[PDB]
């Protein structure tokens, strides 16, 4: 009885369901769906004072499922919750679709990692892809959940749209000085090195191929069934040893490195965001904020970044958070003497 | 012949590091670049970056940090002028005007062109296919766009990428303020390329790692299952393929591996080509998408969008960079 | 092309007429092109 359903879900179809597909397909379909519902139809006028739908007039770059109203706090904003009282429209005007999307997305991400584990167990391979997927989930939980929980409200989370993310990026520089954050520097290093490794390994394989065909199109020199290497690891090791000084000699270590580099970068950036939830910032170097203030001649690129951050902060915040009602007169706004 | 012995030794695949004819140009260019960079990053005096007699202190002995040190770009008073060690009056106005940056840059750019040629050289001397230089041409295009092409397009070597961590961050912010690169589609492609190359790197590595053939015990590294030069395939393409296909759908997983590694090459290389090109067209002031004042209400009032909020932050950056150096309200290139 | 002859039309026209009749603006509380400035950020939680 109970075994029949297990045998059902483990079947070979066009899309594998599995047991994880109960916690993945009902959530992901909602989260993805609530984005398309949001970015087509609902406004951010009552949460943000901005327009963020195709119905407003926005395009794909400037639509978002923006974060909830700043007065909603860290409320879950359930549809039946007190802030909507079951009323659908009042739930969409206060940014309840952001919480719908974010919660269904984190459950979809859990369901997808469970799916990766389940399919590895069914087929019988190691679960390294789920381990590698723990880095996007660490980043998702840091950016969309841990950061707004550490802040005032869900409002300061990232909106589910392109330009909302661009605002989030510039907000993080101006208010957080996030480029100066070393955990983010390791994140950048990990991601850039992951892209370097991807490119260099693909081109190295493609240029150390064996003559396993007769045509000039070398893409037909490989069969799925063959048990032999399609590219010379010896020639590749020789080339990179005499170009770069070092080379891989172990194929398994190479492909573990290709796993390890972007995953650990992405995890280190998640650590940096976890720090920015509590405002624990690598904002400044105390020695240089001191020296530049005892010496009106000491200019470094860092001091010019601190000035740029103040310029961003004062010239964004009056329309970034409109619940705060920041009033800055034109003559306290830091200008650079236009 | 002594000369034939020299050409045998240069083009020799016996050397620990291959030299070749691109390397006989590359090695002195790196010698100068490395020498002047290690010299200037530590001990260069402050540089008059924007030509207004406001020295910017960029070196590690002038009270400055590994994060915040930089070989400071060449003075705006110089512009694109050739300013070597000998055209200056002394060795202290050359240091003051940012000559070290120009010397490092003018040897670093040809050294990378020669490193690319050297990669082709060694591919030719070893009988392997010649296109690792093509993959390397993407970071080279990216580093020439921010060291040569943007200064040429803007008119000064002071608009070049500073040779420092915080200088690089400053370059990013000023570039966003002046060009809105985030709304540039070539930069969205570059971001897709770097993030998707990281995705695909992690993905390909986890798949090859996950479907490894059992050769070892549990108390020894799986990397001992591979022997350098072994002919047998060290992983199971079939098992990784079946897993990936069950993960998404049937006609999605690369069965082929030559196509697979061409895609691994092609995705971040092509996207970094495009983002280097984006820096290069913004060098001629062809900036990103502009959607300010684009959604209007019935009367004509501008309804703010998220692009408006990004503008408002970019204007924040815009009216604070090079503060004592814009005498007119229109900062042209 | 038989059982879907009108099925694809009826659905597409349904979405078109959902926007065109103005039901979308009332469906999601979206401000119409003249309800923006007759600006109201909601300032309270339990009663928006």
């Amino acid at each position: 009885w109970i075994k029949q359903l297990d045998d059902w879900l483990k079947r070979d179809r066009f899309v594998f369901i599995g047991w994880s597909g109960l916690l993945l397909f009902p959530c992901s379909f909602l989260a993805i769906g609530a984005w398309f519902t949001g970015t087509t139809f609902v406004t951010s006028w009552y949460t943000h004072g901005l327009v963020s739908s195709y119905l407003e007039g926005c395009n794909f770059l400037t639509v978002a499922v923006s974060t909830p109203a700043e007065s909603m706090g860290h409320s879950l904003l359930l549809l039946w919750g007190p802030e909507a009282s079951g009323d659908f429209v009042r739930w969409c005007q206060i940014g309840g679709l952001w919480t719908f999307t974010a919660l269904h997305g984190v459950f979809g991400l859990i369901g997808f990692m469970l799916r990766q584990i389940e399919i590895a167990r069914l087929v019988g391979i190691r679960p390294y892809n789920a381990i590698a997927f723990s880095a996007p989930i660490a980043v998702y939980c840091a950016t969309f959940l841990i950061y707004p929980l550490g802040q005032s409200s869900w409002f300061f989370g990232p909106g589910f749209g392109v330009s909302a993310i661009f605002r989030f990026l510039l907000f993080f520089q101006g208010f957080h000085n996030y480029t100066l954050n070393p955990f983010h520097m390791m994140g950048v290093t990990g991601v850039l090195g992951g892209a370097l490794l991807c490119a260099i390994h693909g081109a190295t394989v493609q240029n150390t191929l064996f003559r396993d065909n007769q045509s000039k199109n070398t893409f037909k020199g490989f069969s799925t069934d063959q048990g032999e290497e399609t590219y010379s690891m010896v020639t590749a090791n020789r080339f990179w040893s005499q170009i770069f000084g070092i080379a891989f000699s172990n194929k398994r270590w190479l492909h573990f490195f290709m796993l390890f580099v972007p995953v650990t970068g992405l995890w280190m950036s998640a650590i940096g965001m976890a720090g920015l939830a509590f405002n624990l910032r690598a904002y400044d170097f105390v020695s240089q904020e001191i020296r530049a203030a005892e010496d009106p001649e000491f200019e470094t690129f860092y001091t010019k970044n601190i000035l740029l951050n103040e310029g961003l902060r004062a010239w964004l915040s009056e329309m970034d958070q409109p619940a705060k009602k920041f009033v800055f007169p034109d003559e306290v706004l830091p200008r650079g003497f236009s | 012949s002594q000369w034939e012995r020299f050409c045998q030794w240069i083009t020799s695949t016996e050397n620990r590091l291959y030299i070749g004819w691109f390397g006989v140009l590359m090695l002195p260019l790196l010698g100068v670049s490395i020498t002047v960079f290690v010299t200037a990053f530590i001990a260069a005096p402050p540089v008059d970056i924007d030509g207004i007699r406001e020295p910017l202190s960029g070196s590690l002995l002038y009270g400055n940090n590994i994060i915040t040190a930089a070989v400071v770009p060449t003075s705006n008073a110089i512009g694109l002028h050739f300013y070597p060690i000998w055209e200056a009056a002394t060795l202290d106005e050359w240091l003051y005007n940012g000559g070290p940056y120009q010397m490092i840059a003018f040897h670093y750019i040809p050294a990378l062109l020669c490193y690319l040629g050297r990669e082709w050289e060694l591919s030719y001397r070893l009988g392997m296919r010649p296109w690792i230089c093509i993959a390397y041409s993407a970071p080279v295009a990216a580093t020439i766009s921010v060291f040569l092409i943007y200064p040429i397009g803007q008119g000064s070597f002071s608009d070049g990428l500073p040779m420092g961590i915080s200088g690089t961050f400053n370059f990013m912010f000023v570039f966003q303020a002046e060009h809105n690169i985030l709304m540039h589609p070539f930069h969205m492609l570059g971001v897709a390329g770097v993030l998707g190359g990281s995705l695909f790197c992690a993905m390909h590595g986890s798949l090859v790692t996950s479907s490894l053939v059992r050769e070892t015990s549990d108390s020894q590294s799986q990397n001992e299952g591979y022997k350098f030069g072994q002919e047998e395939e060290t992983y199971n393409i079939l098992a990784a393929h079946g897993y990936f296909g069950r993960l998404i759908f049937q006609y999605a997983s690369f069965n082929n591996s030559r196509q697979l590694h061409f895609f691994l090459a092609a995705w971040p290389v092509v996207c970094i080509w495009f983002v280097a090109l984006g820096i290069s067209t913004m060098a001629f002031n062809l900036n990103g998408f502009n959607f300010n004042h684009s959604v209007l209400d019935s009367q004509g009032r501008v309804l703010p969008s998220w692009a408006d909020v990004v503008n408002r932050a970019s204007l924040g950056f815009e009216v604070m960079h090079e503060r004592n150096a814009h005498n007119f309200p229109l900062d042209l290139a | 092309w038989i059982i879907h002859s009108i099925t694809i039309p009826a659905l597409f026209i349904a979405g078109w007429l959902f926007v065109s009749t103005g039901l979308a603006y009332d469906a999601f509380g979206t401000p119409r092109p003249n309800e923006y400035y007759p600006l109201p950020i909601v300032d309270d939680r339990y009663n928006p």
């Binding site: 066009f14 379909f29 398309f36 087509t40 | 959604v295 | 659905l11 597409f12 979405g15 926007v19 092109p33």
Partner: peptide, 30 residues
């Protein structure tokens, strides 16, 4: 009514509706 008929329609019965709505939005005068 099968599994094939639901995993190709729950994604596409809404999608055509959305596309029809968005095609109508290209003709809205605001």
């Amino acid at each position: 009514f099968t599994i094939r008929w639901l995993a190709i329609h729950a994604l596409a019965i809404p999608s055509v509706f959305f596309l029809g709505s968005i095609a109508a939005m290209q003709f809205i005068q605001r």
